[PDB]
Amino acid sequence: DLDLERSNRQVWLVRLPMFLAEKWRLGKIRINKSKITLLLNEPHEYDLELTKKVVENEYVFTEQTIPKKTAIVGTVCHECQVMPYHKIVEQRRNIVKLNNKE
Amino acid sequence: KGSRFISTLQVKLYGREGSSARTIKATLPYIKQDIPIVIIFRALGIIPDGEILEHICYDVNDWQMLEMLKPCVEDGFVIQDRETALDFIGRRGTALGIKKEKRIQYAKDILQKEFLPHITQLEGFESRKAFFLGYMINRLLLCALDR
Amino acid sequence: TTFRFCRDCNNMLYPREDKENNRLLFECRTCSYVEEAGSPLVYRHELITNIGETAGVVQDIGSDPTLPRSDRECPKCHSRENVFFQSQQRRKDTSMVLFFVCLSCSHIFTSDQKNK
Amino acid sequence: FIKRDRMRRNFLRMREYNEFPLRAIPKEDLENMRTHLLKFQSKKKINPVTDFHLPVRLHRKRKTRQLKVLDENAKKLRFEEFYPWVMEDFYNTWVGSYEAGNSDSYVLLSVEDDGSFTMIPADKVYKFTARNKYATXXXXXXXXXXXX
Amino acid sequence: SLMSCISVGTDPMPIITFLSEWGMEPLEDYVPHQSPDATRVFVNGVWHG
Amino acid sequence: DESAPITAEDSWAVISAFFREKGLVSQQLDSFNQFVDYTLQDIICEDSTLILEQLAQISRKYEISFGKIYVT
Amino acid sequence: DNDEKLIIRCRVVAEEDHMLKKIENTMLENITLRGVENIERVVMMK
Ligand SMILES: [Zn+2]
Ligand SMILES: [Zn+2]
C-alpha cells in the first residue's frame, strides 16, 4: 500500500565535513541574497556553496517478493556543500596524519 | 597485502590495420572465451551506448575513436539488456553452476569480487570499475591511433 | 562521422534511405524515432592522418619547466616569450616542424616557412 | 690537486539577509523511518512522480565434524538484502540499485512552511533506472542469433 | 650506486583521506561533459577521482 | 656570509652526513627491521581465525585465533 | 588532371552503405595500379 504523501516538499542535500557530521550523528542559516552562511551554537559560521542549481530526477523517500510500507517525502531542491579559527582545523587536519601501530 | 593475487585482466583489439570490423574483446578470469567490452558494460549496469562512448572517449570533438567504437556498439546492439548480459557471461564461462538462477548471481559475484581485485571487492562499486574499464579502453584505442 | 544519438534510447542513429520522398534519414532500430537528414555525408575514412600532431595542449602549458624557451615573437601579440614543441602525432613519417605556443594570448603559430 | 685531510685543524682553528534557524528532529521519527535517496538514469530532465501517474508502487522483488569459513556483520546484513525494489503503476518501470560509496556525509535540509529547516542524516542512497522502455528480449533466441 | 636505496612502503589511507578534504570529487560522481578539464588523481594505480 | 652559495667541494660534507646516518648496507637492515616490526603482526592478524563446526543430534562450534605475536 | 582537386565517384546497379564499404576495402587493398608483386623501393645506383 505505497502512497505518495506530498513530494511537494523541497529538500536540500548537504556534504558536511567529518567532525561536524559525526557531531550531528543547532545553528541558524543566514541566506544572503547568492551567498549563504551558517551560525552554529557556541560556533563557526559556514558559507554553503550552491553546488548544483538544477537538480531534477532526484527525490527523497522513506520506508516504514516482500512488499513493505513505502512513503514518499519530497523533491530535491538544490545540491549544496558546506565550506569552512581555521588554523586549528588545519592543524587538526595535519594532526590526523600521525596514526601509528604498536 | 594478503593472498598474493595473480589474476591479470587483458583487453584485446582484434583486426589488423587496414581491414574493417576491428572489434574489441576483453578476457575475464574463470570465463573461457573472450567477451566484448560493451557486453561487460551491460553487465556492470550501464545499458545505453551513449554513456558507454561517454566513459570510453572523454572528448566529443574527436570522431576517430568513436568511429572505431562502432562495431562494438553493433555487437552491443545484439545484446541490449543487463540481465541478458549477466546470463550471457553466466552461460559463457564457468559451467559448474548448472542452475541458471545461481549462475547469474554467481556471475554478478564474479563481477563484484574476482573482476578487478584492486580498488575493492565489495558490492556496489560497478560504476567506478566501469569508469576504470573505459579508461583502459581509452588507452588501448588511444594507442591504436598512433598517438 | 559525427553521428547523433536517439532520444530516450540514446542509441546510435543508423542511416535510413527514404524511398517515398527520396531523402536521407536517421533511425534508431530499437524504437520508432527517425529524424531528418541535414547533410548527405555519412562516412569519411580519411587515410593520411595529419591531426594529433598538436595534441595535449592545456591552459597550464606555460608552467611546464621541462619544456624549452625561445625568443621568437608572436605574429599576433608580438610576444618574444613563448614555448615551442614538435608534433605530438608519433609516427615514422612525422615531420620535425616546430610548434610555437605564445605565453600571452595562448596562440599556436608554427615555424613552417613552406606551408602555413 | 691533493686530498685535503687536515680539515680537523682548520675547523678547530676556525670554530538583504534572512536568518533562519536549524533544528534536529527528535530521534523517534528517525527510529520509525529510514531516509534513502533517489536518482534516476533516463537522461530526461523532468520525470516527476506526479507524471509517473498512479498507483505508484515501490516494492522489493551425512557429514561428520567439518570446517566453516567466517564473515562479519554489516556486510552480511547488506548481503542478505539482495532483492532490489521497483516502482510501477498497474506502464512505467523503475528498478533501483545501491550506491554505497555515496554514503559518507549526506545531510538533508528539508524545507517546511516556515523559513526554518529540518536536518535529517541520510541512511543510504539508490540509483533508479527506467526499465523496459522498448519492451523486447529473447535469451536463447539471441544466443542462436549471435552465432551467425 | 653509492647513494641508491630501496623504498619500504607506507600507508596510502591518510593521503586519500587528505585529498577529499580540499574538494577532490569522487569517481562515481564524474561527468566528462560537466568537467572535461578535470585532472585525474591516481593513488597506486587506483583511480579514486 | 651564512646565506652564501655553496661550492662543489662543500657537497662532499653532505655525502658524509649521508653515510653517517644510513651506512653502506642500510636497505637490508631497514627492510628486515620493518618486516620484523609490521609484517609479522600483519601476517598473523590477516588470517588467524579458524573455527571447527561440530554437529550433534544440538549444534556446536569451536574457535582458535592468534593475537599479538612475540619475538625474542 | 587539370582539376586542382582529384575526384573519383562510383555507384552500383538492405542499406547500400555496407555494400559500398566492402567495395572500399576491395579498392584500397586489392587493386594494384602497376608493377609486379613483392617489389618496393627501387633504388638507382651508379
Ligand atoms: Zn531509440
Ligand atoms: Zn601570442
UniProtKB/Swiss-Prot annotation, chain A:
Subcellular location: Nucleus
Domain of life assignment: Eukaryota
Coiled coil spans: none
The family this protein is said to belong to: Belongs to the TFIIF beta subunit family.
Note: Present with 520 molecules/cell in log phase SD medium.
Annotated function: TFIIF is a general transcription initiation factor that binds to RNA polymerase II. Its functions include the recruitment of RNA polymerase II to the promoter bound DNA-TBP-TFIIB complex, decreasing the affinity of RNA polymerase II for non-specific DNA, allowing for the subsequent recruitment of TFIIE and TFIIH, and facilitating RNA polymerase II elongation.
Subunit structure: TFIIF is composed of three different subunits: TFG1/RAP74, TFG2/RAP30 and TAF14.
Protein name as catalogued: Transcription initiation factor IIF subunit beta
Region of the whole protein represented: 58 to 250 of 400
UniProtKB/Swiss-Prot annotation, chain D:
Subcellular location field: Nucleus
Top-level taxonomic group: Eukaryota
Function noted in UniProt: TFIIF is a general transcription initiation factor that binds to RNA polymerase II. Its functions include the recruitment of RNA polymerase II to the promoter bound DNA-TBP-TFIIB complex, decreasing the affinity of RNA polymerase II for non-specific DNA, allowing for the subsequent recruitment of TFIIE and TFIIH, and facilitating RNA polymerase II elongation.
Family the UniProt entry places it in: Belongs to the TFIIF alpha subunit family.
Additional detail: Present with 1920 molecules/cell in log phase SD medium.
Subunit structure: TFIIF is composed of three different subunits: TFG1/RAP74, TFG2/RAP30 and TAF14.
The name this protein goes by in its record: Transcription initiation factor IIF subunit alpha
Source organism of this protein record: Saccharomyces cerevisiae (strain ATCC 204508 / S288c) (Baker's yeast)
Residues of the full protein shown: 21 to 403 of 735
Swiss-Prot record, chain F:
Localization annotation: Nucleus
Source superkingdom: Eukaryota
Comment field (misc): The binding of ribonucleoside triphosphate to the RNA polymerase II transcribing complex probably involves a two-step mechanism. The initial binding seems to occur at the entry (E) site and involves a magnesium ion coordinated by three conserved aspartate residues of the two largest RNA Pol II subunits. Present with 18700 molecules/cell in log phase SD medium.
Function noted in UniProt: DNA-dependent RNA polymerase catalyzes the transcription of DNA into RNA using the four ribonucleoside triphosphates as substrates. Second largest component of RNA polymerases II which synthesizes mRNA precursors and many functional non-coding RNAs. Proposed to contribute to the polymerase catalytic activity and forms the polymerase active center together with the largest subunit. Pol II is the central component of the basal RNA polymerase II transcription machinery.
Family that this chain belongs to: Belongs to the RNA polymerase beta chain family.
Subunit structure of this chain's protein: Component of the RNA polymerase II (Pol II) complex consisting of 12 subunits.
Protein name: DNA-directed RNA polymerase II subunit RPB2
Organism: Saccharomyces cerevisiae (strain ATCC 204508 / S288c) (Baker's yeast)
Complete-protein stretch covered: 20 to 98 of 1224
Swiss-Prot record, chain G:
TM spans (from-to): none
UniProt PTM: The tandem 7 residues repeats in the C-terminal domain (CTD) can be highly phosphorylated. The phosphorylation activates Pol II. Phosphorylation occurs mainly at residues 'Ser-2' and 'Ser-5' of the heptapeptide repeat. The phosphorylated form of Pol II appears to carry, on average, one phosphate per repeat. The phosphorylation state is believed to result from the balanced action of site-specific CTD kinases and phosphatases, and a 'CTD code' that specifies the position of Pol II within the transcription cycle has been proposed.
Annotated signal peptide: none
Compartments (UniProt record): Nucleus
Domain comment, as recorded: The C-terminal domain (CTD) serves as a platform for assembly of factors that regulate transcription initiation, elongation, termination and mRNA processing.
Subunit structure, as described in the record: Component of the RNA polymerase II (Pol II) complex consisting of 12 subunits. Interacts with DEF1; the interaction is direct and serves to bridge RPB1 to the Elongin complex in a DNA-damaged dependent manner. Interacts with the Elongin subunit ELA1. Interacts with the Elongin subunit ELC1. Interacts with ASK10. Interacts with ESS1. Interacts with RTT103. Interacts with SHE2.
Family as reported in the entry's similarity comment: Belongs to the RNA polymerase beta' chain family.
Protein name: DNA-directed RNA polymerase II subunit RPB1
Species assigned in the record: Saccharomyces cerevisiae (strain ATCC 204508 / S288c) (Baker's yeast)
